[PDB]
């Protein structure tokens, strides 16, 4: 798995 | 923590 | 640039 | 249309 972090504002291991 | 998904294709809990 | 789409619920080229 | 930008490593409005 793999970090990741979001942003669309709304804003967070997969 | 909230589901997350993505699609770039590269397409994977927040 | 590539087309995307993210799910986060909140669901739309970069 | 509304700032995206993601981060999972492959990292860029909808
Ligand atoms: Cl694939």
Same mark, same amino acid.
């Given at each position: @798995?793999? %970090?990741?972090?979001? %942003?669309? @504002?709304? $804003?967070? $291991?997969?």
């Amino acid at each position: @798995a793999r %970090l990741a972090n979001f %942003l669309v @504002a709304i $804003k967070x $291991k997969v």
